[PDB]
Scaffold this active site. Structure first.
Site, PDB file in Angstrom:
ATOM      1  CD  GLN E  11      -2.712   1.168   2.553  1.00  0.00           C
ATOM      2  OE1 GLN E  11      -2.823   0.129   3.203  1.00  0.00           O
ATOM      3  NE2 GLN E  11      -3.408   2.263   2.832  1.00  0.00           N
ATOM      4  CD  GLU E  62      -3.263  -5.073   1.302  1.00  0.00           C
ATOM      5  OE1 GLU E  62      -2.687  -6.041   0.763  1.00  0.00           O
ATOM      6  OE2 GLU E  62      -2.865  -4.552   2.366  1.00  0.00           O
ATOM      7  CB  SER E 131       6.550  -0.371   4.466  1.00  0.00           C
ATOM      8  OG  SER E 131       6.193   0.826   3.800  1.00  0.00           O
ATOM      9  N   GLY E 135       2.808  -6.889   6.084  1.00  0.00           N
ATOM     10  CA  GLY E 135       3.156  -8.255   5.720  1.00  0.00           C
ATOM     11  C   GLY E 135       3.470  -8.409   4.244  1.00  0.00           C
ATOM     12  CB  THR E 136       1.616  -7.451   1.180  1.00  0.00           C
ATOM     13  OG1 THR E 136       0.462  -8.188   1.606  1.00  0.00           O
ATOM     14  CG2 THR E 136       1.803  -7.628  -0.319  1.00  0.00           C
ATOM     15  CB  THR E 170       0.833   2.098  11.748  1.00  0.00           C
ATOM     16  OG1 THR E 170       1.759   1.400  10.907  1.00  0.00           O
ATOM     17  CG2 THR E 170       1.080   3.594  11.637  1.00  0.00           C
ATOM     18  CG  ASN E 197       6.026   7.313   7.594  1.00  0.00           C
ATOM     19  OD1 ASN E 197       5.065   7.680   6.918  1.00  0.00           O
ATOM     20  ND2 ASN E 197       6.791   6.288   7.248  1.00  0.00           N
ATOM     21  CD  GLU E 245      29.319   8.838 -13.084  1.00  0.00           C
ATOM     22  OE1 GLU E 245      29.384   9.833 -12.332  1.00  0.00           O
ATOM     23  OE2 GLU E 245      29.556   8.895 -14.308  1.00  0.00           O
TER      24      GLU E 245
HETATM   25  N1  GTP Z   1       5.454   6.845   4.459  1.00  0.00           N
HETATM   26  C1  GTP Z   1       4.396   6.100   4.151  1.00  0.00           C
HETATM   27  N2  GTP Z   1       4.268   4.835   4.685  1.00  0.00           N
HETATM   28  C2  GTP Z   1       3.192   4.071   4.378  1.00  0.00           C
HETATM   29  C3  GTP Z   1       2.211   4.551   3.523  1.00  0.00           C
HETATM   30  N3  GTP Z   1       1.267   3.595   3.391  1.00  0.00           N
HETATM   31  C4  GTP Z   1       1.628   2.525   4.135  1.00  0.00           C
HETATM   32  N4  GTP Z   1       2.814   2.808   4.760  1.00  0.00           N
HETATM   33  C5  GTP Z   1       3.564   1.908   5.653  1.00  0.00           C
HETATM   34  O1  GTP Z   1       3.190   0.572   5.388  1.00  0.00           O
HETATM   35  C6  GTP Z   1       3.012  -0.159   6.583  1.00  0.00           C
HETATM   36  C7  GTP Z   1       1.876  -1.166   6.429  1.00  0.00           C
HETATM   37  O2  GTP Z   1       1.896  -1.781   5.157  1.00  0.00           O
HETATM   38  P1  GTP Z   1       0.971  -1.203   3.973  1.00  0.00           P
HETATM   39  O3  GTP Z   1       1.785  -0.341   3.037  1.00  0.00           O
HETATM   40  O4  GTP Z   1      -0.186  -0.428   4.553  1.00  0.00           O
HETATM   41  O5  GTP Z   1       0.414  -2.483   3.175  1.00  0.00           O
HETATM   42  P2  GTP Z   1       1.401  -3.646   2.667  1.00  0.00           P
HETATM   43  O6  GTP Z   1       2.781  -3.097   2.397  1.00  0.00           O
HETATM   44  O7  GTP Z   1       0.808  -4.287   1.438  1.00  0.00           O
HETATM   45  O8  GTP Z   1       1.441  -4.714   3.866  1.00  0.00           O
HETATM   46  P3  GTP Z   1       0.090  -5.413   4.381  1.00  0.00           P
HETATM   47  O9  GTP Z   1      -0.835  -4.370   4.956  1.00  0.00           O
HETATM   48  O10 GTP Z   1       0.422  -6.423   5.452  1.00  0.00           O
HETATM   49  O11 GTP Z   1      -0.578  -6.102   3.218  1.00  0.00           O
HETATM   50  C8  GTP Z   1       2.716   0.868   7.663  1.00  0.00           C
HETATM   51  O12 GTP Z   1       3.417   0.557   8.844  1.00  0.00           O
HETATM   52  C9  GTP Z   1       3.204   2.189   7.103  1.00  0.00           C
HETATM   53  O13 GTP Z   1       4.337   2.631   7.812  1.00  0.00           O
HETATM   54  C10 GTP Z   1       2.332   5.823   2.983  1.00  0.00           C
HETATM   55  O14 GTP Z   1       1.466   6.255   2.226  1.00  0.00           O
HETATM   56  N5  GTP Z   1       3.429   6.596   3.300  1.00  0.00           N
HETATM   57  N1  GDP Z   2      38.941  20.656 -16.177  1.00  0.00           N
HETATM   58  C1  GDP Z   2      37.757  20.058 -16.450  1.00  0.00           C
HETATM   59  N2  GDP Z   2      37.458  18.896 -15.815  1.00  0.00           N
HETATM   60  C2  GDP Z   2      36.288  18.258 -16.051  1.00  0.00           C
HETATM   61  C3  GDP Z   2      35.342  18.843 -17.009  1.00  0.00           C
HETATM   62  N3  GDP Z   2      34.280  18.020 -17.054  1.00  0.00           N
HETATM   63  C4  GDP Z   2      34.527  16.994 -16.199  1.00  0.00           C
HETATM   64  N4  GDP Z   2      35.722  17.141 -15.599  1.00  0.00           N
HETATM   65  C5  GDP Z   2      36.327  16.214 -14.612  1.00  0.00           C
HETATM   66  O1  GDP Z   2      36.067  14.866 -15.001  1.00  0.00           O
HETATM   67  C6  GDP Z   2      35.792  14.062 -13.856  1.00  0.00           C
HETATM   68  C7  GDP Z   2      34.665  13.097 -14.193  1.00  0.00           C
HETATM   69  O2  GDP Z   2      34.988  12.462 -15.425  1.00  0.00           O
HETATM   70  P1  GDP Z   2      34.207  11.145 -15.908  1.00  0.00           P
HETATM   71  O3  GDP Z   2      32.868  11.499 -16.506  1.00  0.00           O
HETATM   72  O4  GDP Z   2      34.049  10.176 -14.763  1.00  0.00           O
HETATM   73  O5  GDP Z   2      35.201  10.563 -17.028  1.00  0.00           O
HETATM   74  P2  GDP Z   2      34.959   9.120 -17.694  1.00  0.00           P
HETATM   75  O6  GDP Z   2      34.534   8.123 -16.645  1.00  0.00           O
HETATM   76  O7  GDP Z   2      36.257   8.673 -18.316  1.00  0.00           O
HETATM   77  O8  GDP Z   2      33.893   9.223 -18.758  1.00  0.00           O
HETATM   78  C8  GDP Z   2      35.419  15.009 -12.727  1.00  0.00           C
HETATM   79  O9  GDP Z   2      36.222  14.729 -11.577  1.00  0.00           O
HETATM   80  C9  GDP Z   2      35.721  16.405 -13.234  1.00  0.00           C
HETATM   81  O10 GDP Z   2      36.668  17.042 -12.375  1.00  0.00           O
HETATM   82  C10 GDP Z   2      35.741  20.111 -17.661  1.00  0.00           C
HETATM   83  O11 GDP Z   2      34.992  20.671 -18.487  1.00  0.00           O
HETATM   84  N5  GDP Z   2      36.928  20.639 -17.336  1.00  0.00           N
HETATM   85 MG    MG Z   3      -1.114  -3.764   3.067  1.00  0.00          MG
END
Ligand code: GTP
Ligand code: GDP
Ligand code: MG
Ligand code: GTP
Ligand code: GDP
Ligand code: MG
Lengths: 430, 428, 91, 431, 428
Positions: E11, E62, E131, E135-136, E170, E197, E245
């Site tokens: 859910q 559900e 979560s 249970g699910t 909950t 939460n 990365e």
């Molecule tokens: N942050 C957040 N948590 C949620 C939300 N809905 C459910 N939960 C979490 O989910 C837990 C319960 O499970 P649900 O998501 O309601 O349903 P489920 O995951 O299918 O598990 P069952 O109810 O046993 O079937 C609760 O303890 C909540 O913490 C939501 O909208 N936001």
């Molecule tokens: N001097 C300079 N450095 C750059 C520029 N663009 C990226 N870098 C450096 O390149 C690094 C990342 O490169 P990356 O994409 O991983 O290279 P690749 O993995 O070989 O494709 C970073 O640490 C940057 O400091 C630029 O325009 N000038």
């Molecule tokens: Mg549920």
């Protein structure tokens, strides 16, 4: 030129043929009278009055199933004598349709087949629709095509037929017909498209959203697949494939002619509005175990041959792109003796859709015909349930009362035990 | 004078040849009606090589089209240059082979070979001095890989001195659309080794790769693949139909790259192939052509000459250039890649130049190479053929045609012999 | 989605459309949102469930469509691009 | 004739090469279409060192832009001089190294070195007589600090005779954006010492100090630092590109510059750094130029030259002057700062003059110094690396690539030996 | 191109995804239908008629929680099959979601990602919210990471989760779920961002002046944080930072992958009117212990690594100066083996503001990912709470009745104990 004649057997074949010859006429644009307001020359033939008549024979031993077609919207489209009826049916008895009731109208049906074959110049093949369940669809269907083999030794005869479902069933003495029907489809058949009804129910409920489907919805899907195989015959294509070439690239040995059909994309427009449908996507749908038309598991049996029938706005490259992924998949298996097991078919025009139908139109489509060794387990399921009824001689007196010698019940069972053991031979890899 | 008959077999052959006669008509300035609207005098001087003269300044192609299935005839008839042909030259059957090699070679081919040979005989006696014949076919079919071998055998005994040319299409292992494809190929190549002056291994998979990588095409169709083939085989006769800086024809080449009668298997190439984005950059220059002459992504073959030794190389050039650098890019490319050329043959490369560039283009060429890498393709097929033949799979179709069992064994023996001497010539 | 196809894009059903006798016809007070909402929509006999949200024109939905503006290999290979420089205006 | 091909490794080196091509395109009068609109014949007398001819009078840089991440190439194309580069020249992978040196060197770099090598061989075989390659990269990333060294070793084996310079950016400890930066520097310096003809050490902190104090820029973007570095390479190669009263080139500098093959790390200097107070005129002489040159504020290194002994000094002048006062000023500084120079090498200064001034200016000068100060940087890198490595911290990322533990040990042994002989060359004694 | 796939669990994941994907849609310009009126390519996938389906899966046990979203304003935007539901839930039973109810729907989730993974070309990382209380959200979330690890061996998985609050709760049986979930987040994850939460409760009241906030007021803060992480990937910046990365410069040992997030400035419109903001002030607030959204004092521990994601109108000159001030402070400490503990990131596009939300529009922002040893003591209260539950065997029959053997409870506690001692090895 290329021509195919319809020998639809049974109530199922009549109902499917109603659905098919609907899909056929709106594919070209034939009015219900039968007048265009030569792609039709595979399925329709002209007369003196410029009218196109289907190459079909609808044959039954009960009149009512054909009588509604005689009172249907296409009464004048059809030739009345090709609608052949019978006074009494086999009543779900294989012996009645084979030795007693079938022989009365054998001459009339075959003479009709002769006259329609005399109309055609070069016949490619016959398409036959029946079921393993009904007495008309099993016993009488067996005898006509035993006789058709000796009348036309070289002409192709495909066999699309309905399989008794693994769980649901309409009748009870169906497996006795099924065990006694399966011998003819072995020594006298070129390919078999045994499918069970229960597979259509699941895909209609999932993919097409229909929670309450009926046989009109099942029969439209069947007609689309038959529309898919003959599409390369009817229309041009980049890689046009007739019946003969894909006949060769499925059958490794004369005994094995049982491929599995699959169609894609079969999706309701509710799902298709926001869904990307590409070539690489749809072939993955063809490989879906839940989308298979036969209630077996594809992973249980490795593949020996596959047929690909693409249709619509498709290109070879994405087809090449699609196939190259499918080979790089570990759990999908192929037999050791077939390194390349595909037959790519490409067509131009996308499939048509019927109003009041089910399928959403798609610019592209694909039909899959897979010969795998997983299908043989369905016959084994048939072999068990025939065993626990024949042991105590249930319902045997009906077949014996018709004039059938009880030993054939044994021999037909040994045919499938030998048939299934040959499928196991293919599964063994050296 | 020097005439060629364009024998056409199979759906692959019928489409490829159909796109040819469109291409070469444009080079000679011929409308789909058939007349001559060309401007330069040299555009109409040697049109009798490929075309028979007709009334009103019309030039009917010297091509005969063979296919068991009459459906493809309607397609090529309905094409752009469809009515150009002579329907007296379409000879077609009523039933196809269904990709079955044995059906075409014996069963249904015997009924149609007579009418094809009658049309070929009419065209052979029509012109006074033939240079030879030309066949386009695929090795994965039933008509082109079937009776096309049968037509070759009948013609070779009828016209032994005449050079025959076949631009066969070899099936690919990675991309295959026929299950019985290894069976048709292994029985068709045995007809090729016995009776063939010259063969080319064109693979559809490398056509796919070039369209993916070189031309960067989003949606290339089959017309694009044949149009590339339309460029390649046109360049081998451009020195024939047109005068050149250094003139050449089929015989001057065909003598030069055949060291022994068994080996006539090559990898064709085509110079100025770029995508639209590359066109803005680069410089029009012959060194770029030489970089495209021996280019990695150039040649058609499904094999790589890293893994073999180049026996012979030929390069016919199209357009007006200077002679010098052509022989130097020639000379240097021999020097540095020394191991990749055989040592028993000095000056492995041969060149020809034709003055007239292709239509719309200033510079072009064609690549002709004999390397040991073509043996990579053969041992691939035996890996597919042996596995299918070990269990006698798919055998009843061929066996139902009345043919024996020993024909498979002798065909693979000849290829096993063929690759054995081919490997031997690598290590010499 | 309204612009898709000249016939109007497929829409949620209406109480005029519910007419008489379909399975989603019941007494009490009826609002269009009840039949629109999938939780209390009533399925029909051999028909797809109607769309809760308006769906595009039936004529063309399409999974993916592109023709490509590559230019075509005949044009590309014949007309290899000779360099063209723009004649700029006087300054 | 004398042609240079430019390898462009990493994001840092990628932008570096982009701005360098921009500034020398301005120098040679090349529009971003790629043609010529300039006026002088010396502007296109010797362009072909860095450019390749294309039909219709087009000119393209001899560059290969290599990266493991295709994000930077989109920015390169979106840049001003983006369409001037050849479409086939860019070489990029699909998965980046994540600033992991082992990933760049071994895991993903083996998948791209083949295409990098064949493109670079095409570019080398296009030209008749190649002088050497220039590689722009940083020592703190995963791609440029990684597979760039693999390219270095491969082209070292392929072309031993052609010269090799690396405009390498070295990470700073005072300001650093990477924690595994000591690991990357440690495993890159061992490659650099073994395979490099000459190395130019660029410090981003030094550039920031210069822009803060000498130039007083309120908002230093990376464009300003890159413009400085591009001016540095332009001053390096202007003697090659244009005739001077006393000509020189990269080999002239290197052979006279390098006393022993182990030592090739150099600090550059760029003289006319003027802030808004000094934006009045260029009415100045070689005295003022030299005083701006020899101040360690104007240096772009990470090591005070007064803390060590200047081994060798080189100065290249851009513009037309008289050599008399130039020689007088060099002898002046040599006699003045007696202790800062080595005794065993009399006349520690090499001088060169190129008559053609830089564009947008009329006086400029660059300096390349090898001093004992650079040993302060390797030791500090070692101090960070030892603390990183003693507790095996951040080592599982490297070991999961399949590499052994002795490689870090041999790298740090190589640097310890290098700084030891560096200290010996500092404390050379007697005669 | 870059891609992040959303596997919201529970859910909490449904409502967080409601806040996120709403903020995501406004961030690009996606209308509720899903049409633009390729920075979006990392979160949306193109479809047929020009729609951009969010690359997320909404899963729960559900049905009603997702059913509101199916009737929400973005109903047509999302994919109904992406919305995965279940008939019965675990009801705060870890064993039920791990062994009894989850196994029915294990396959369905893996088929939806199969659709998604086909859409992606190169997927950059896997984003999962759940979560530790429900249970699910705990047991089912545990088993998917088990299967995802073997399916995606090399792939990156992040762990955004709700850590149960130290004081308020909950649930009562939640620490049994929390203790049994540590094995998965220790071995089947790459980076873990436990947030309670209760600390967000203080920050919303203390700084944003909202005395009566709802669950949506916490969720928008969470979506803003996740938006800050991916803002380098979505749009260009001076220092664009990928997931790989900062994963590299955050994890000193494979067991220690639990950083603490920090977002600033979080101020009301009335408060921000009188307060001019600069780089120096915003980072200083990020090391305030009152602004940490984890109830622990980093002043009680020592930092080992800090990733630093700027956003908005920021200049690297002010970045270097700000780091200079922070390093010169005895209050802010570091481990002895990490002389440089920073990972600087700069973006151009400022964070957007949701209509009807809380945060005022500020030209610049700051995100901090601090890995400290002070997070360890937050677990130390859990084992104490868990110990006084387990010693007298409270609520055990619920888990054992599902089919889970009582010995794993001791093992999971011993697992969490080993994590605390490993945190002490860093502290020395
Ligand atoms: N942050 C957040 N948590 C949620 C939300 N809905 C459910 N939960 C979490 O989910 C837990 C319960 O499970 P649900 O998501 O309601 O349903 P489920 O995951 O299918 O598990 P069952 O109810 O046993 O079937 C609760 O303890 C909540 O913490 C939501 O909208 N936001
Ligand atoms: N001097 C300079 N450095 C750059 C520029 N663009 C990226 N870098 C450096 O390149 C690094 C990342 O490169 P990356 O994409 O991983 O290279 P690749 O993995 O070989 O494709 C970073 O640490 C940057 O400091 C630029 O325009 N000038
Ligand atoms: Mg549920
Ligand atoms: N899919 C589908 N199957 C049908 C349909 N109609 C009949 N069947 C099948 O046919 C089987 C029985 O045979 P029928 O077609 O009803 O009648 P029949 O083939 O003429 O044989 P008899 O009943 O002896 O006259 C049943 O088990 C059904 O599965 C249909 O409209 N659609
Ligand atoms: N390159 C190329 N291949 C083609 C073409 N047409 C068909 N093919 C190939 O030919 C094979 C089938 O040939 P087929 O029609 O059976 O030939 P046929 O039996 O001689 O008529 C397929 O594998 C196709 O890949 C074409 O125009 N170009
Ligand atoms: Mg019946």
């Amino acid at each position: 030129m290329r021509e195919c004649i319809s020998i639809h057997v049974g109530q199922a074949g009549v109902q499917i043929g109603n659905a098919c010859w609907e899909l056929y006429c709106l594919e070209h644009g034939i009015q219900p009278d039968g007048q265009m307001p030569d792609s039709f020359n595979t399925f329709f033939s002209e007369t003196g009055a410029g009218k196109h008549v289907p190459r079909a024979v609808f044959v039954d031993l009960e009149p009512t199933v054909v009588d509604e077609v005689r009172t249907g919207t296409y009464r004048q489209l059809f030739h009345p004598e090709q609608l052949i009826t019978g006074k009494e049916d086999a009543a779900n008895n294989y012996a009645r349709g084979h030795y007693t009731i079938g022989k009365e109208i054998v001459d009339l049906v075959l003479d009709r087949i002769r006259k329609l074959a005399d109309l055609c110049t070069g016949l490619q093949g016959f398409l036959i629709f029946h079921s393993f369940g009904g007495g008309t669809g099993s016993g009488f269907a067996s005898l006509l095509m035993e006789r058709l083999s000796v009348d036309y030794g070289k002409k192709s005869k495909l066999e699309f037929a309905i399989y008794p479902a693994p769980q649901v069933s309409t009748a009870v003495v169906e497996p006795y017909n099924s065990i006694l029907t399966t011998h003819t489809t072995l020594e006298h058949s070129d390919c078999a498209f045994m499918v069970d009804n229960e597979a259509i129910y699941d895909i209609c409920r999932r993919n097409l959203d229909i929670e309450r489907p009926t046989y009109t919805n099942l029969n439209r899907l069947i007609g689309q697949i038959v529309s898919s195989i003959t599409a390369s015959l009817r229309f041009d294509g980049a890689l046009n494939v007739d019946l003969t070439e894909f006949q060769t690239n499925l059958v490794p040995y004369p005994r094995i002619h049982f491929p599995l059909a699959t169609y894609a994309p079969v999706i309701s427009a509710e799902k298709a509005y926001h869904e990307q449908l590409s070539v690489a996507e749809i072939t993955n749908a063809c490989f879906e175990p839940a989308n298979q038309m036969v209630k077996c598991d594809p992973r249980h049996g490795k593949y020996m041959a596959c047929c690909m029938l693409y249709r619509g706005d498709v290109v070879p490259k994405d087809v090449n792109a699609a196939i190259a992924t499918i080979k790089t998949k570990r759990t999908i298996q192929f037999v050791d003796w077939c390194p390349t097991g595909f037959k790519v078919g490409i067509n131009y025009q996308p499939p048509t859709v019927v109003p009041g139908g089910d399928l959403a139109k798609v610019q592209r489509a694909v039909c899959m015909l897979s010969n795998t060794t997983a299908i043989a387990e369905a016959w084994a399921r048939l072999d068990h349930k025939f065993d626990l009824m024949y042991a105590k001689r249930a319902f045997v007196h009906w077949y014996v009362g018709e004039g059938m010698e009880e030993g054939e019940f044994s021999e037909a069972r040994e045919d499938l035990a030998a048939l299934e053991k040959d499928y196991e031979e293919v599964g063994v890899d050296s | 004078m020097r005439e060629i008959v364009h024998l056409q077999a199979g759906q692959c052959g019928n489409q490829i040849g159909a796109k040819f006669w469109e291409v070469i008509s444009d080079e000679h300035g011929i409308d789909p009606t058939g007349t001559y609207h060309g401007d330069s005098d040299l555009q109409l001087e040697r049109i009798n090589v490929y075309y028979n003269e007709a009334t009103g300044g019309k030039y009917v192609p010297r091509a005969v089209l063979v296919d068991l299935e009459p459906g493809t005839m309607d397609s090529v008839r309905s094409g752009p240059f469809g009515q150009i042909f002579r329907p007296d030259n379409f000879v077609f059957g009523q039933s196809g082979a269904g990709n079955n090699w044995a059906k075409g070679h014996y069963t249904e081919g015997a009924e149609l070979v007579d009418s094809v040979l009658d049309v070929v005989r009419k065209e052979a006696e029509s012109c006074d001095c033939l240079q030879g014949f030309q066949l386009t076919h695929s090795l994965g079919g039933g008509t082109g890989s079937g009776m096309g071998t049968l037509l070759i055998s009948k013609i070779r005994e009828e016209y032994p001195d005449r050079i025959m040319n076949t631009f066969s299409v070899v099936p690919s292992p990675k991309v295959s659309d026929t299950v019985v494809e290894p069976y048709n190929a292994t029985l068709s190549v045995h007809q090729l080794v016995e009776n063939t002056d010259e063969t080319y291994c064109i693979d559809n998979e490398a056509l796919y790769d070039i369209c993916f990588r070189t031309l960067k095409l989003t949606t290339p169709t089959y017309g694009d693949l044949n149009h590339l083939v339309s460029a390649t085989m046109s360049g081998v006769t451009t020195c024939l139909r047109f005068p050149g800086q250094l003139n050449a024809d089929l015989r001057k080449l065909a003598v030069n790259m055949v060291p022994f009668p068994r080996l006539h298997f090559f990898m064709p190439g085509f110079a100025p192939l770029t995508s639209r984005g590359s066109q803005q950059y680069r410089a029009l220059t012959v060194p770029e052509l030489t970089q495209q002459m021996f280019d990695a992504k150039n040649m058609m073959a499904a094999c790589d000459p890293r893994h073999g030794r180049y026996l012979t190389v030929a390069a016919v050039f199209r357009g007006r250039m200077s002679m010098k650098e052509v022989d130097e890019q020639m000379l240097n490319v021999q020097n540095k890649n020394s191991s990749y050329f055989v040592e028993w043959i000095p000056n492995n490369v041969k060149t020809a130049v034709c003055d007239i560039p292709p239509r719309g283009l200033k510079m072009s060429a064609t690549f002709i190479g004999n390397s040991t890498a073509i043996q990579e393709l053969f041992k691939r097929i035996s890996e597919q053929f042996t596995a299918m033949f070990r269990r006698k799979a798919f055998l009843h179709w061929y066996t139902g045609e009345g043919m024996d069992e020993m024909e498979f064994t002798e065909a693979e023996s000849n290829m096993n012999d063929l690759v054995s001497e081919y490997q031997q010539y690598q290590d010499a | 989605t309204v612009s898709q196809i000249c016939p109007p894009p497929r829409r949620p059903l209406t109480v005029v459309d519910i007419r008489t006798g379909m399975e989603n016809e019941r007494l009490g007070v009826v609002r269009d949102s009840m039949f629109q909402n999938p939780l209390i929509v009533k399925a029909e006999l051999g028909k797809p469930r109607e769309r809760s949200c308006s769906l595009p024109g039936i004529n063309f939905n399409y999974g993916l469509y592109i023709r490509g503006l590559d230019g075509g290999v005949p044009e590309a290979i014949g007309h290899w691009n000779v360099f063209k420089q723009q004649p700029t205006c006087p300054h």
